[PDB]
Amino acid sequence: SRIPVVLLACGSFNPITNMHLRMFEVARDHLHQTGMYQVIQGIISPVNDTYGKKDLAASHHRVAMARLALQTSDWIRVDPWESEQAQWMETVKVLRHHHSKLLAVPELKLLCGADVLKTFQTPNLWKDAHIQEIVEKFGLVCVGRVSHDPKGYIAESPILRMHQHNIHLAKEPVQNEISATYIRRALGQGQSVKYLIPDAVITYIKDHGLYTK
Amino acid sequence: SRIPVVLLACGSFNPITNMHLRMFEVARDHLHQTGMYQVIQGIISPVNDTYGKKDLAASHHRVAMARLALQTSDWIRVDPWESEQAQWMETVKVLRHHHSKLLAVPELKLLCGADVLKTFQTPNLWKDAHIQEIVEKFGLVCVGRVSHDPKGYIAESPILRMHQHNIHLAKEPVQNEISATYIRRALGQGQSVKYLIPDAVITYIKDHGLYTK
Amino acid sequence: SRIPVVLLACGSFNPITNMHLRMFEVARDHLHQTGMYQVIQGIISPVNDTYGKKDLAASHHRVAMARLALQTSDWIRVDPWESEQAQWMETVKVLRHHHSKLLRVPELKLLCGADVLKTFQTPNLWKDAHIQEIVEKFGLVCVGRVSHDPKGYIAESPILRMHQHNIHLAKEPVQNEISATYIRRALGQGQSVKYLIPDAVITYIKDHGLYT
Amino acid sequence: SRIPVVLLACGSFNPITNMHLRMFEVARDHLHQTGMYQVIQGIISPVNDTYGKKDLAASHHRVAMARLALQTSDWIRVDPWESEQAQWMETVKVLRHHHSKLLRVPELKLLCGADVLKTFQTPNLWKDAHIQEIVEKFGLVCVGRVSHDPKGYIAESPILRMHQHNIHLAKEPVQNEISATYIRRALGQGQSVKYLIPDAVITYIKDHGLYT
Numbered sequence: 001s002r003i004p005v006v007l008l009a010c011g012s013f014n015p016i017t018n019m020h021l022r023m024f025e026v027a028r029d030h031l032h033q034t035g036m037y038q039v040i041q042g043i044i045s046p047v048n049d050t051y052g053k054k055d056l057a058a059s060h061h062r063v064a065m066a067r068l069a070l071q072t073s074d075w076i077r078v079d080p081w082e083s084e085q086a087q088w089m090e091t092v093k094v095l096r097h098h099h100s101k102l103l104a105v106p107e108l109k110l111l112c113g114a115d116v117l118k119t120f121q122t123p124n125l126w127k128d129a130h131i132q133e134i135v136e137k138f139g140l141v142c143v144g145r146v147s148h149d150p151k152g153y154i155a156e157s158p159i160l161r162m163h164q165h166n167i168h169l170a171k172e173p174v175q176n177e178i179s180a181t182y183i184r185r186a187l188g189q190g191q192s193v194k195y196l197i198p199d200a201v202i203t204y205i206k207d208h209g210l211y212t213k
Numbered sequence: 214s215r216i217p218v219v220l221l222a223c224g225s226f227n228p229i230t231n232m233h234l235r236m237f238e239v240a241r242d243h244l245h246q247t248g249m250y251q252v253i254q255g256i257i258s259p260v261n262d263t264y265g266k267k268d269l270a271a272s273h274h275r276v277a278m279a280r281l282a283l284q285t286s287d288w289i290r291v292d293p294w295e296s297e298q299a300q301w302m303e304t305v306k307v308l309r310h311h312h313s314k315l316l317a318v319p320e321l322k323l324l325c326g327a328d329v330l331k332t333f334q335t336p337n338l339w340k341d342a343h344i345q346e347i348v349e350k351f352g353l354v355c356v357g358r359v360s361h362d363p364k365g366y367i368a369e370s371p372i373l374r375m376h377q378h379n380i381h382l383a384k385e386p387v388q389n390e391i392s393a394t395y396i397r398r399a400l401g402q403g404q405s406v407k408y409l410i411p412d413a414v415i416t417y418i419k420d421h422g423l424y425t426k
Numbered sequence: 427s428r429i430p431v432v433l434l435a436c437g438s439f440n441p442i443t444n445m446h447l448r449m450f451e452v453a454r455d456h457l458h459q460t461g462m463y464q465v466i467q468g469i470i471s472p473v474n475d476t477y478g479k480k481d482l483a484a485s486h487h488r489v490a491m492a493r494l495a496l497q498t499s500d501w502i503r504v505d506p507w508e509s510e511q512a513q514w515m516e517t518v519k520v521l522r523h524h525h526s527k528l529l530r531v532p533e534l535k536l537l538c539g540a541d542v543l544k545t546f547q548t549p550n551l552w553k554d555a556h557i558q559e560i561v562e563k564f565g566l567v568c569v570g571r572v573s574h575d576p577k578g579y580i581a582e583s584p585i586l587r588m589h590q591h592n593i594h595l596a597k598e599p600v601q602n603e604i605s606a607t608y609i610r611r612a613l614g615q616g617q618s619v620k621y622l623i624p625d626a627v628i629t630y631i632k633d634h635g636l637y638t
Numbered sequence: 639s640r641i642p643v644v645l646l647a648c649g650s651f652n653p654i655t656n657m658h659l660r661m662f663e664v665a666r667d668h669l670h671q672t673g674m675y676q677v678i679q680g681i682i683s684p685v686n687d688t689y690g691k692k693d694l695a696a697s698h699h700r701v702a703m704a705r706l707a708l709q710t711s712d713w714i715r716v717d718p719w720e721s722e723q724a725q726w727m728e729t730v731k732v733l734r735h736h737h738s739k740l741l742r743v744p745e746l747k748l749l750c751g752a753d754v755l756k757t758f759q760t761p762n763l764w765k766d767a768h769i770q771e772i773v774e775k776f777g778l779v780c781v782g783r784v785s786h787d788p789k790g791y792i793a794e795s796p797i798l799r800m801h802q803h804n805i806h807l808a809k810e811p812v813q814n815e816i817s818a819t820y821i822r823r824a825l826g827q828g829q830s831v832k833y834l835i836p837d838a839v840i841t842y843i844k845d846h847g848l849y850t
């Protein structure tokens with residue numbers, strides 16, 4: 001029969017957008033189309049507030065916006081564990097945690113856009129051993145993005161190439177490069193972002209006065 | 214003070230998508246940003262069933278899907294008058310009708326994507342006199358689309374150039390080229406189109422068995 | 427053995443751009459990849475000056491620019507026959523013309539971007555009999571373009587879906603949406619279009635005062 | 639009178655492509671449009687071979703390809719200084735080097751795509767003092783790219799927003815997203831990349847067996 005799969009998306013979700021959500025749907029249809037997997041759940045894990053140089057809305061709000069965005073989803077939920085930790089946590093550790101949570105066990109795979117695959121090449125960003133454990137022990141489902149060539153990223157990285165069977169490249173013939181950075185700027189200018197991010201998220205942002213100049 | 218404006222979008226809406234909806238929002242913010250207009254309403258007018266060579270879902274359903282898509286909009290409504298006529302009607306006639314309906318009168322403008330502006334150049338598609346009345350007596354608000362250069366379309370058409378003050382070019386720094394043709398194909402294959410078109414529209418399509426192979 | 431193929435691209439080429447050229451390369455690689463064909467020649471056929479409601483550069487200029495653009499190509503050539511006819515000609519007639527020449531046998535296929543497939547749906551634009559002859563007698567090689575879904579255009583066309591064996595969809599893994607309308611506007615504003623169209627074409631345009 | 643400007647693009651150029659070249663043309667036109675500057679020179683500075691976790695073609699090859707790509711440019715040149723250093727150098731040091739040479743005065747500005755602005759946010763990638771020196775001592779000219787919002791990157795950076803007078807956002811009205819990674823993969827598969835990168839660069843690549 002089919003191997004059960006849980007998809008984990010780690011990211012900022014500042015705020016969660018229709019594209020972040022579309023990523024799950026495209027990935028699920030892709031895995032199902034292979035004939036060997038059955039996606040039983042998706043998890044949105046917002047990053048901790050201590051992360052990066054960029055100023056993010058409080059994780060309390062990013063978790064809230066995801067929960068509200070996911071109310072019309074019957075298979076994707078937000079998990080705040082990662083954001084509730086005292087500090088930022090390398091992605092491989094978040095995978096380990098959720099794998100333990102599942103502990104005939106479904107395979108847990110990291111879901112991301114092709115741009116993340118490119119960041120694996122950034123000096124000192126990801127430890128080689130972590131890249132290895134991510135693709136070998138968990139798996140990667142990557143959704144295409146304009147200007148990125150995942151196939152080449154895989155061919156040019158010895159670690160990815162060696163475990164390419166555990167990397168699933170998905171993509172849809174659509175162009176949807178709405179950036180959350182633009183969303184925040186537009187919101188700051190009083191412009192509409194309706195139909196780019198969920199109606200429920202816009203309501204929360206308005207009610208809590210988020211992303212103001 | 215500001216000139217009141219009603220935006221009319223004529224099209225197939227087979228089915229209405231998040232991009233069709235985004236078009237209204239981008240256009241409204243653009244007109245408001247000029248400082249001289251106040252958009253008070255938007256109208257989605259699905260095309261008649263006798264139109265074109267392409268097979269469209271019944272207008273009864275396209276009107277229903279738009280109504281449901283617009284339930285969370287406080288300023289855009291669907292108007293079935295055009296689709297209820299015995300036969301297809303040139304766009305200038307639909308504008309005339311809605312102008313009469315409004316009859317200190319707000320300006321009624323045709324809302325469309327830049328690709329429509331390009332179709333004005335198609336032999337025998339639009340009567341020169343209609344193109345003229347559309348831009349001169351009503352107005353055009355055009356939203357940018359990848360691969361189209363509205364500014365050049367305007368410069369190269371003597372009629373548009375002469376009335377360019379009545380043509381408003383809007384666009385947002387986003388890439389969103391999701392085609393309804395892809396939506397229908399995906400739906401026909403059992404794939405998800407969630408987050409590309411409204412949740413309410415997907416529910417109607419599923420409940421009424423639309424767009425099946 | 428592989429089937430010999432000649433690719434014919436009909437269009438304005440006002441002016442020819444790197445995108446138009448790229449279309450040939452992608453189509454050829456796709457056809458060779460199928461293992462069933464051997465593309466032996468490419469033909470750029472600029473449209474006549476009476477065509478449409480547009481002020482196009484004179485046909486002899488568009489032919490000359492295409493020729494310059496193709497100097498570094500060892501398999502694509504421009505053919506002025508079509509532009510040199512007294513009047514505009516439906517595309518199927520251009521295919522028939524070039525088919526006859528080939529006979530004086532390779533298969534002749536129309537080469538176009540996905541957007542062209544969408545124009546097949548435009549009321550009164552293409553005669554149904556002509557769409558049928560194109561995909562039934564000849565063939566169609568389509569290069570993808572952003573915002574277009576060729577697979578859906580084919581499936582929804584009662585004529586195209588019955589001839590898929592003669593339709594070849596070559597996907598463009600790169601994003602190359604450079605509009606010739608934009609090229610003309612930029613040129614008219616005195617802005618650079620270098621690296622968007624061939625250097626020799628830019629020079630010709632300058633020398634002859636085109637698009638000013 | 640207009641302020642003399644020299645544009646410096648640091649990058650892999652593995653290999654140089656039509657997009658990299660287009661970036662210079664768009665930036666120059668944008669700067670001239672402001673009416674305040676006169677771009678007098680463009681400089682392509684390929685990165686050293688010790689840089690990053692990537693198997694890059696040898697620096698002398700990337701320099702040679704850039705030189706060939708630029709033969710038809712009357713204002714852009716490749717400078718191998720950087721690639722010829724014993725080790726990789728932070729970009730601000732390359733700017734200082736080229737600034738000194740200019741002195742042996744024109745303003746030297748870093749030229750990059752919008753994506754570079756986003757990398758400024760990457761933990762430990764760029765020293766804050768360096769980002770400050772780049773936009774405060776020199777200048778930054780950014781060319782738009784699909785999926786990136788430079789205006790937001792600037793507004794959200796406590797360093798960039800304080801130096802907007804020295805940041806110039808040049809918008810790319812065309813869609814030109816051709817990945818050098820894709821170019822390399824296509825080449826390795828024996829597929830054409832003609833019209834995506836200069837002909838002379840393709841020839842050099844073939845002659846020297848690069849990307850096989």
Ligand SMILES: NC(=O)c1ccc[n+]([C@@H]2O[C@H](COP(=O)([O-])OP(=O)(O)OC[C@H]3O[C@@H](n4cnc5c(N)ncnc54)[C@H](O)[C@@H]3O)[C@@H](O)[C@H]2O)c1
Pocket residue numbers: 009010011012013014019020023047051089090091092111112113114115116125126127130143144145176177178180
């Ligand atoms: N463990 C490590 O060493 C290490 C190093 C760097 C980053 N990280 C992790 O990586 C994450 C960084 O997330 P982020 O700030 O980029 O998240 P984000 O909110 O910007 O995006 C979330 C996800 O959406 C995808 N996405 C966004 N727009 C898309 C589109 N249009 N199409 C397809 N996919 C799209 C992104 O690729 C990403 O996978 C964090 O969880 C961080 O902890 C880990």
Ligand SMILES: NC(=O)c1ccc[n+]([C@@H]2O[C@H](COP(=O)([O-])OP(=O)(O)OC[C@H]3O[C@@H](n4cnc5c(N)ncnc54)[C@H](O)[C@@H]3O)[C@@H](O)[C@H]2O)c1
Pocket residue numbers: 222223224225226227232233236260264302303304305324325326327328329338339340343356357358389390391393
């Ligand atoms: N009066 C005439 O002579 C004449 C001739 C031809 C067509 N028409 C009219 O034109 C309409 C044709 O509509 P259609 O079939 O193209 O409608 P459609 O459903 O495909 O699209 C509706 C609108 O959405 C815009 N749009 C779609 N995707 C977009 C995106 N990603 N970004 C921005 N805008 C986007 C389109 O430009 C269009 O204005 C009909 O109302 C028809 O009656 C009139």
Ligand SMILES: NC(=O)c1ccc[n+]([C@@H]2O[C@H](COP(=O)([O-])OP(=O)(O)OC[C@H]3O[C@@H](n4cnc5c(N)ncnc54)[C@H](O)[C@@H]3O)[C@@H](O)[C@H]2O)c1
Pocket residue numbers: 435436437438439440445446449473477515516517518537538539540541542545551552553556569570571602603604606
């Ligand atoms: N026989 C008929 O009934 C009929 C009806 C309408 C048009 N036509 C013919 O169709 C042609 C119309 O040509 P045009 O004005 O669009 O020519 P054009 O110069 O704009 O483009 C020529 C070709 O390039 C392709 N192309 C352009 N940019 C591209 C990109 N970025 N990526 C991929 N492909 C790209 C186009 O799809 C087209 O196939 C003429 O030859 C005309 O006679 C025939």
Ligand SMILES: NC(=O)c1ccc[n+]([C@@H]2O[C@H](COP(=O)([O-])OP(=O)(O)OC[C@H]3O[C@@H](n4cnc5c(N)ncnc54)[C@H](O)[C@@H]3O)[C@@H](O)[C@H]2O)c1
Pocket residue numbers: 647648649650651652657658661685689727728729730749750751752753754757763764765768781782783814815816818
């Ligand atoms: N000093 C530091 O701390 C530091 C840290 C990281 C990187 N760097 C430097 O940054 C550079 C990294 O270069 P790279 O590997 O990205 O080079 P690259 O060859 O990929 O590209 C070079 C330039 O082209 C631009 N570009 C590419 N495709 C484009 C397109 N389609 N449209 C517009 N612009 C486009 C890129 O944005 C970039 O500015 C190196 O010089 C490196 O030393 C410096």
